[PDB]
Amino acid sequence: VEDWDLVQTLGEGAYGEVQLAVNRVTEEAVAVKIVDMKRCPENIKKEICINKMLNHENVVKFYGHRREGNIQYLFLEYCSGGELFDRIEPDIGMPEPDAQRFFHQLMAGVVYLHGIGITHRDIKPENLLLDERDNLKISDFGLATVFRYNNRERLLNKMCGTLPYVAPELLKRREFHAEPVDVWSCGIVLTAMLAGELPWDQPSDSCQEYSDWKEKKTYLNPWKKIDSAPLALLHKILVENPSARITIPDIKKDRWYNKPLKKGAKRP
Ligand SMILES: C[C@@H](O)CNc1ncnc2[nH]c(-c3ccccc3)c(-c3ccccc3)c12
């Protein structure tokens, strides 16, 4: 019931590689993130320890781990749908109703995380996995960390993530709040789903495309493909000052967020 055959190598992280793992008698398929700590006892010890806390429907479940000398094995909910990256066609994005549905589920997980005091720190379509019913699942807590413990917030100073999805305060300020950095990356994800392209390489004044966004030139490419209603949400999310930036409770009160677009399940 636990003799796990490694059926087919499924993907490849920078740290190691994932394999599909189907059981003998039950056939319960799981994902097995495999990382050689030599090829450490801390960077992956924090990923497991955060994972042990996490239990949400929009967060890749963590089943267990095993030590195995040098290599560590992370046993995680299998998402047969793959990445949300592959449901975004270049230069178009995806149907607006699918975007809104994925965004509702992205906010649900991110709220949950922020409630248990942790921040993902690297939200992007590659780390957002769909299951078999296409439900979204926040993946990879390798860069995640505690920003709140015993009801006291601590600020972040470690710079990390992916440059196009990273918030501007991450580059300028010495220290910053965690939650608005996640909101920013979620707003970049919305842009990708609706436009099929990333707006810029990084939110730095040395980047022309970021300065054009700050000048409200929404006649240029990423933003011209979008639509007033969702674009107005992105206007409230992609605000340079993280204090002025919209918070998740207020994203839930947004017009487009609560605009009805998508039907129910076909014959279910
Ligand atoms: C840190 C982990 O959560 C990432 N791995 C997964 N974990 C749980 N479920 C997963 N499903 C996939 C997947 C990859 C490609 C096709 C279908 C599924 C994967 C997957 C996706 C991309 C690369 C490697 C594995 C996956």
Short mmCIF file of N, CA and C and ligand atoms in Angstrom, two decimals, residues 10-12 18 31 33 47 60 76-83 129 139-140, ligand 1:
data_model
loop_
_atom_site.label_atom_id
_atom_site.label_comp_id
_atom_site.label_asym_id
_atom_site.label_seq_id
_atom_site.Cartn_x
_atom_site.Cartn_y
_atom_site.Cartn_z
N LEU A 10 8.15 13.45 -14.66
CA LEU A 10 7.02 14.30 -15.02
C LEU A 10 7.45 15.72 -15.35
N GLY A 11 8.34 16.27 -14.52
CA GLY A 11 8.94 17.56 -14.79
C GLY A 11 10.36 17.65 -14.24
N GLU A 12 10.92 18.85 -14.29
CA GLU A 12 12.29 19.08 -13.84
C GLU A 12 12.42 20.47 -13.22
N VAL A 18 10.87 16.23 -10.52
CA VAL A 18 9.68 15.54 -10.03
C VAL A 18 9.41 14.26 -10.83
N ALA A 31 2.80 13.14 -6.59
CA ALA A 31 3.97 13.77 -7.18
C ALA A 31 5.10 13.67 -6.17
N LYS A 33 8.61 15.37 -5.62
CA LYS A 33 9.70 16.32 -5.78
C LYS A 33 10.96 15.74 -5.14
N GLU A 47 10.88 24.36 3.40
CA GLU A 47 9.83 24.01 2.44
C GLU A 47 8.91 22.92 2.98
N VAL A 60 -1.50 22.97 -3.14
CA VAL A 60 -0.96 21.62 -3.31
C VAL A 60 -0.70 20.95 -1.95
N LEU A 76 3.58 14.96 -2.64
CA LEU A 76 2.67 16.09 -2.82
C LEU A 76 1.49 15.75 -3.75
N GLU A 77 0.36 16.40 -3.51
CA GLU A 77 -0.86 16.23 -4.32
C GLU A 77 -0.56 16.29 -5.82
N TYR A 78 -1.07 15.31 -6.57
CA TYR A 78 -0.86 15.27 -8.01
C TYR A 78 -1.87 16.14 -8.74
N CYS A 79 -1.36 17.03 -9.59
CA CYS A 79 -2.18 17.94 -10.39
C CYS A 79 -2.05 17.57 -11.86
N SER A 80 -2.99 16.76 -12.35
CA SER A 80 -2.91 16.22 -13.72
C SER A 80 -3.07 17.28 -14.81
N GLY A 81 -3.65 18.43 -14.45
CA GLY A 81 -3.79 19.55 -15.36
C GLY A 81 -2.51 20.28 -15.73
N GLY A 82 -1.49 20.18 -14.88
CA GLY A 82 -0.21 20.81 -15.16
C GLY A 82 -0.20 22.26 -14.74
N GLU A 83 0.57 23.09 -15.44
CA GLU A 83 0.74 24.49 -15.07
C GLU A 83 -0.30 25.36 -15.77
N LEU A 129 -0.78 25.24 -10.39
CA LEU A 129 -1.10 23.96 -11.02
C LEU A 129 -2.59 23.68 -11.01
N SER A 139 1.61 26.17 -5.83
CA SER A 139 2.66 25.16 -5.84
C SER A 139 3.99 25.77 -5.45
N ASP A 140 4.83 24.98 -4.79
CA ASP A 140 6.24 25.31 -4.53
C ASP A 140 6.39 26.36 -3.44
C1 LIG B 1 6.69 21.46 -6.15
C2 LIG B 1 5.63 20.60 -6.86
O1 LIG B 1 4.29 20.88 -6.38
C3 LIG B 1 5.73 20.74 -8.40
N1 LIG B 1 5.38 19.40 -8.96
C4 LIG B 1 4.10 18.93 -8.91
N2 LIG B 1 3.51 18.71 -7.71
C5 LIG B 1 2.26 18.23 -7.65
N3 LIG B 1 1.56 17.98 -8.76
C6 LIG B 1 2.10 18.19 -9.96
N4 LIG B 1 1.60 17.98 -11.22
C7 LIG B 1 2.52 18.37 -12.15
C8 LIG B 1 2.36 18.23 -13.53
C9 LIG B 1 3.41 18.55 -14.42
C10 LIG B 1 3.23 18.36 -15.80
C11 LIG B 1 2.06 17.76 -16.27
C12 LIG B 1 1.06 17.37 -15.38
C13 LIG B 1 1.23 17.60 -14.01
C14 LIG B 1 3.68 18.71 -11.44
C15 LIG B 1 4.84 19.25 -12.01
C16 LIG B 1 4.74 20.31 -12.92
C17 LIG B 1 5.90 20.85 -13.51
C18 LIG B 1 7.15 20.34 -13.17
C19 LIG B 1 7.25 19.28 -12.27
C20 LIG B 1 6.10 18.73 -11.69
C21 LIG B 1 3.38 18.68 -10.07
#
